[PDB]
Design an enzyme around this catalytic site. Structure first.
Site, PDB file in Angstrom:
ATOM      1  CB  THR A 145      -3.123   5.806   5.734  1.00  0.00           C
ATOM      2  OG1 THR A 145      -3.683   7.117   5.611  1.00  0.00           O
ATOM      3  CG2 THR A 145      -2.605   5.596   7.126  1.00  0.00           C
ATOM      4  CB  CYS A 146      -2.286   0.791   4.726  1.00  0.00           C
ATOM      5  SG  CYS A 146      -1.670  -0.848   5.165  1.00  0.00           S
ATOM      6  CB  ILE A 147       1.087   2.292   0.771  1.00  0.00           C
ATOM      7  CG1 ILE A 147      -0.018   1.386   0.216  1.00  0.00           C
ATOM      8  CG2 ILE A 147       2.362   2.049  -0.006  1.00  0.00           C
ATOM      9  CD1 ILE A 147       0.251  -0.110   0.343  1.00  0.00           C
TER      10      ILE A 147
END
Length: 850
Positions: free
Chosen positions: A819-821
């Site tokens: 998600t964060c990437i």
């Protein structure tokens, strides 16, 4: 003494105009000539001096066309009237109003005056221009003893007014009993009809009067209808007049049963009959059981007739339920003692349940038989299938509602009937055929059954296999056509509850203004106003929400902070530093229902975890990525490698900051000594996730829900998932497919135009709107874009692009996301048929689990 002035100056005014003078030639002065003298008790001396005169009183004075003889009847003296009657002053001479001197003495009660007029044969029957007469004037005025002394002089008492009403008919309409006591003694007729057939009885019940109707029965009145058939009884009903009806029953006990037959009359006001029966139930217990038992015989009748395929649906269907709301209402009032108030009906006190529910049971035995058919039908018809489900299922659902309405009476508040429960599981395979046949019956008939929370808790049997494209209509259909938990249907109306907004600091100011104002007062177009500025009728409203949206996340207040993804917000765990801490949170939850209930949106998006708590749902380990990925990875290592190879054992009680020291506290309550057994680390993964957020937050989160629940039913929005919910709040976003194509970044093995990727997007174009939107959340959590769109991706790990990477394996495995990437991850699907088979199948199960 004190009245000596009257004693002296009665002689003086004789001297002051002692010498005689004839009355005026004009009509204006004659009243001026004698009116003070009559009042001044010169009535005897004036009768002495005007014994020689030339003028007559009937030459009426002034504009009014009245006489002094009217004043003679007013001021109350005869000795002047002695001489006036020598003149032959016509008493029946009238004013412009048509009234007499008599009505004054009637109005004034001057008895002897009223006598002497009849000694001159006063035509009493002369009504005024209004059609009212003396006897009518007195009964209304409650003057009886003269009316004894008056009526004795005449035999024409039966002669009516202009409209046909006798004073007897009048007194009953007003409740003047002692007046009636005399009139009957004086020979009044009892059953004398008016033109419409109105006896005095009919008039009394219209008025809601008790004591006179008691009397007319003693003297022997009759129970009769009017011309059209309307009885006295139907009045007290329409009036809500309970006690008067009780009197009739002492003399006509056949009437009790007639009341019960009225309840199936649609025209009546249900909120009147409650006054009657609730009164009679309190009258005595011997009446009490006769009521309830008598109601049920009507119910048992209508139900068997309702199940009869001939009966029309909508008619009987209310006619049943029109009864039971009382029958329930009475039992919760419970048995009242003979001529004394309520008794509880506790154990040992006669068991009301032993009798009153008895006649009904045939209905339920009758009920189960039909359902036993359908089971044999559905089971044995499943391969070779008008269908009775199509035909009459609407009927039965009326009755099943009767089975919750009845059983829930003999249990306390908010406590479920156990007998109802077992009834559901027996036939649970059948009920599901009704809901799939018609889902929104759940709002009308099965309302409480599946939306009372502890039942909704228990009756998840159906709420899952509740079809889901039903929800697709119901983002909006059951917002716009309401959400009927009795209140998301219509609003109240409120005007004068204006809010004075403090532009300089709205947040702290509006904290106060709302907590003053009441709940339903704010389910309307809210009177938004500033200190000393109109600005706009209601367009100013949108400033209030849109501005507060950014002020809650005003970080100096320390309520919320960003994620590790830099885009989403979440509540600050170290917000405990604040002097006032919780009270602000309550303000927020009050907002959102108003954005919801008035269906205007808001531009903020929170983290996905925070929605899961609102719906009372449990957390997964992915939700830690918002706060710190390292613990999420450290929790992943535990699943990557079982404890069988592990040498460093973990404690189930760990040092943690909770706005305090690094206090080691048990992970399970009390069992802080155990370690990670092979069968135990699952809980270790679980509680570290929960109690890191929960224990740090739970005092904070709850204040948000108190207000969010204030304007919202919790029983409804359990409907929605966590991915459908964020869209009602921030609107269905816009999706330029091309913008999404151009910002892609293919890497970790894939090239930008390999066969798979060309075949990927081919599948997406077939997908709907409410599924592509969920894809975005699955790789970014965030669901909507800034101004510049996907070329202006907010990213979060920096403003990085929608990215893809590989995890090559046969089609057995399913997709995954980082998600964060803002990266997606894909095992390879080595064929277009694998794609057409596995990918189309793998995306859906991968994009969401059930």
């Amino acid at each position: 003494m004190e009245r000596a002035m009257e004693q002296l100056n009665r002689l003086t005014r004789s001297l002051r105009r002692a010498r005689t003078v004839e009355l005026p030639e004009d009509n204006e002065t004659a009243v001026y000539t004698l009116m003070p003298m009559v009042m001044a008790d010169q009535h005897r001396s004036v009768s002495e001096l005007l014994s020689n005169s030339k003028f007559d009183v009937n030459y009426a004075f002034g504009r009014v066309k009245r006489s002094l003889l009217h004043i003679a009847a007013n001021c109350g003296s005869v000795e002047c009237l002695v001489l006036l009657l020598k003149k032959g002053a016509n008493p029946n001479y009238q004013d412009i109003s048509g009234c007499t001197p008599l009505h004054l003495a009637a109005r004034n009660g001057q008895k002897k005056c009223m006598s002497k007029l009849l000694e001159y044969s006063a035509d009493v029957n002369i009504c005024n221009n209004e059609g009212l007469t003396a006897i009518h004037w007195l009964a209304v005025n409650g003057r009886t003893e003269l009316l004894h002394d008056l009526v004795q002089h005449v035999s024409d008492v039966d002669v009516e007014d202009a409209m046909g009403q006798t004073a007897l008919h009048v007194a009953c309409q007003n409740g003047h009993k002692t007046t009636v006591q005399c009139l009957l003694d004086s020979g009044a007729d009892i059953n004398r009809p008016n033109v419409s057939g109105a006896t005095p009885l009919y008039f009394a019940c219209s008025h809601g009067q008790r004591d006179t109707a008691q009397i007319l029965l003693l003297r022997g009145a009759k129970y009769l209808p009017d011309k059209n058939g309307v009885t006295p009884l139907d009045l007290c009903v329409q009036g809500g007049y309970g006690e008067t009806c009780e009197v009739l029953i002492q003399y006509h006990p056949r009437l009790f049963q007639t009341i019960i037959q009225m309840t199936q009359n649609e025209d009546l006001r249900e909120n009147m009959l409650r006054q009657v029966l609730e009164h009679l139930s309190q009258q005595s217990e011997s009446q009490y059981l006769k009521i309830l038992t008598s109601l049920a015989e009507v119910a048992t009748t209508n139900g068997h007739k309702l199940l009869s395929l001939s009966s029309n649906y909508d008619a009987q269907m209310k006619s049943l339920l029109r009864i039971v709301r009382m029958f329930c209402h009475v039992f919760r009032i419970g048995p009242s003692s003979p001529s004394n108030g309520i008794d509880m009906g506790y154990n040992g006190n006669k068991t009301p349940r032993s009798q009153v529910f008895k006649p009904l049971e045939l209905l339920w035995h009758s009920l189960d038989e039909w359902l036993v058919l359908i089971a044999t039908e559905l089971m044995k018809n499943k391969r070779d299938s008008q269908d009775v489900i199509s035909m009459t299922a609407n009927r039965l659902s009326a009755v099943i509602q009767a089975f919750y309405m009845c059983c829930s009476c003999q249990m306390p508040p908010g406590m479920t009937s156990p007998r109802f429960i077992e009834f559901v599981c027996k036939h649970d395979e059948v009920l599901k055929c009704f809901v799939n046949r018609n889902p929104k019956i759940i709002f009308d008939h099965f309302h409480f059954l599946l939306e009372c929370p502890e039942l909704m808790s228990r009756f998840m049997h159906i709420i899952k296999a509740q079809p889901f494209k039903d929800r697709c209509e119901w983002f909006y259909e059951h917002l716009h056509s309401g959400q009927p938990d009795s209140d998301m249907v219509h609003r109240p109306v409120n005007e004068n509850d204006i809010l004075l907004v403090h532009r300089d600091s709205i947040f702290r100011s509006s904290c106060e203004v709302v907590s003053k104002a009441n709940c339903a007062k704010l389910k309307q177009g809210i009177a938004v106003r500033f200190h000393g500025e109109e600005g706009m009728g209601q367009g100013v409203v949108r400033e209030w929400f849109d501005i507060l949206s950014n002020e809650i996340v005003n970080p100096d207040y320390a309520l919320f902070t960003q994620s590790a993804d830099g885009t989403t917000f979440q509540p600050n765990s170290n917000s405990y530093v604040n002097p006032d801490h919780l009270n602000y949170f309550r303000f927020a939850g009050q907002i959102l229902g108003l954005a919801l209930n008035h269906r205007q949106l808001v531009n903020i998006y929170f983290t996905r975890s925070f929605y899961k708590h609102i719906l009372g749902i449990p957390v997964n380990y992915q939700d830690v990525a918002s706060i710190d990925p390292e613990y999420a990875k450290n929790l992943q290592w535990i699943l990557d490698n079982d404890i069988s190879d592990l040498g460093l054992e973990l404690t189930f009680s760990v040092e943690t900051d909770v706005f305090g020291a690094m206090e080691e506290v048990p992970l399970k309550p009390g069992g802080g000594s155990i370690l990670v057994t092979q069968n135990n680390k699952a809980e270790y993964v679980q509680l570290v996730t929960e109690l890191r957020m929960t224990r740090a937050i739970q005092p904070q989160i709850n204040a948000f829900l108190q207000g969010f629940h204030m304007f919202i039913p919790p029983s409804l929005i359990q409907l929605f998932d966590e991915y459908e919910l964020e869209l009602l709040l921030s609107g269905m976003p816009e999706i330029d497919v091309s913008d999404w194509i151009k910002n892609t970044e293919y890497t970790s093995g894939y090239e930008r135009e390999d066969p798979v990727i060309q075949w990927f997007w081919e599948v997406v174009e077939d997908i709907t709107q409410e599924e592509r939107v969920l894809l975005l959340q699955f790789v970014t959590g965030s669901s909507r874009v800034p101004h510049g769109g996907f070329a202006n991706i907010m990213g979060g790990s920096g403003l990085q692009n929608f990215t893809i990477a590989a995890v090559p394996y046969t089609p057995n495995l399913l997709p995954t996301s980082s998600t964060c990437i803002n990266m997606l991850k894909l095992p390879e699907y080595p064929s277009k048929e694998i794609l057409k088979d596995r990918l189309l199948v793998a995306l859906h199960c991968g994009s969401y689990g059930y």
